[PDB]
Write a protein that binds this ligand. Structure first.
Ligand code: LS4
Length: 282
């Protein structure tokens, strides 16, 4: 703890405050996350330290001192939320959107193959650098432990399913995909019920035909209004057919029919993917 010099505060995450800090010893700049400890969490976190991938923010060290928990992560200078705000006037170039989505799916495919889920994907958790790379941050912390944005929450979570799967991360990514394309949140709910209804009004109220078992979900109510499904060409206008085709498979109601990160990587949308370098103003 005293081995780190705080330079600035990067924001208060869900599991604690994040700071940009300098390691007195090394001199390296890192992201210091103060949490707030059960042994279950300690072991869980320990496993994440082994999860190494170019599109995953590396967990450098875990400091459990004086019954306090500090996580040291590699540091990246900007998150996707800030990059989108800075590009609000012209939008993010399609080649760059395609590159970012491709890398994010590689990262998720790696995590999901290790049975590790993010559970809380959102623009703020996606970090970028000057080299054109993008990385997933805060991966696996939801399980290690336990106004919040509900905008990217999968339908099965909102309906009370307590044993969610890797599919919830694909749903969140799909929502982010749509947001980069249109420059506007896809389902900006301001409460759990409002979130669910915004999804229903766009994708249509789900039934047993499209989502077997949906009516047996814990929070499902027969009294839910029935809205018709809206056409995708209206939802994410500029996106070509390859893109809309991919997006639709990422947003399937039934978690079991929703596309995996692995299968999405082979989708025709990525046939012409490249790695452009973004103009970043740090
Ligand atoms: O670099 C980081 N590694 C992490 C691991 C887990 C959780 C968070 C992080 C993390 C955060 N970095 C970061 C750096 C800059 C910005 S920003 O430029 O978009 N906004 C701010 N800049 C200064 C203060 S707030 C946002 C996130």
């Amino acid at each position: 703890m005293e081995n780190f010099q705080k330079v600035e505060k990067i924001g208060e995450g869900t599991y604690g405050v994040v700071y940009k800090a300098r390691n007195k010893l090394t001199g390296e700049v890192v992201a210091l996350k103060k949490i707030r400890v059960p042994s279950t969490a300690i072991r869980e976190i320990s496993l994440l330290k082994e999860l190494n991938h170019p599109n995953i923010v590396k967990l450098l060290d875990v400091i459990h001192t004086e019954n306090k928990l500090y996580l040291v992560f590699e540091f990246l200078h900007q998150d996707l939320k800030k990059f989108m705000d800075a590009s609000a006037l012209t939008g993010i170039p399609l080649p760059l959107i395609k590159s970012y989505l491709f890398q994010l799916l590689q990262g998720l495919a790696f995590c999901h193959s290790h049975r590790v889920l993010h559970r809380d994907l959102k623009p703020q958790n996606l970090l970028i650098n000057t080299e054109g790379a993008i990385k997933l941050a805060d991966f696996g912390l939801a399980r290690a432990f336990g106004v919040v944005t509900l905008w990217y929450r999968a339908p099965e979570i909102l309906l009370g399913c307590k044993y969610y799967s890797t599919a919830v991360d694909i749903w969140s990514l799909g929502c982010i995909f749509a947001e980069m394309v249109t420059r506007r949140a896809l389902f900006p709910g301001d409460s759990e019920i409002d979130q669910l209804f915004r999804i229903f009004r766009t994708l249509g109220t789900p039934d047993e035909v499209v989502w077997p078992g949906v009516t047996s979900m814990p929070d499902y109510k027969p009294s839910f209004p029935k809205w018709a499904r809206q056409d995708f060409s209206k939802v994410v206008p500029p996106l070509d057919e390859d893109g809309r085709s991919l997006l639709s498979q990422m947003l399937h109601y039934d978690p079991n029919k929703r596309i995996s990160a692995k299968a999405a990587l082979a989708h025709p949308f990525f046939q012409d993917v490249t790695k452009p370098v973004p103009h970043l103003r740090l």
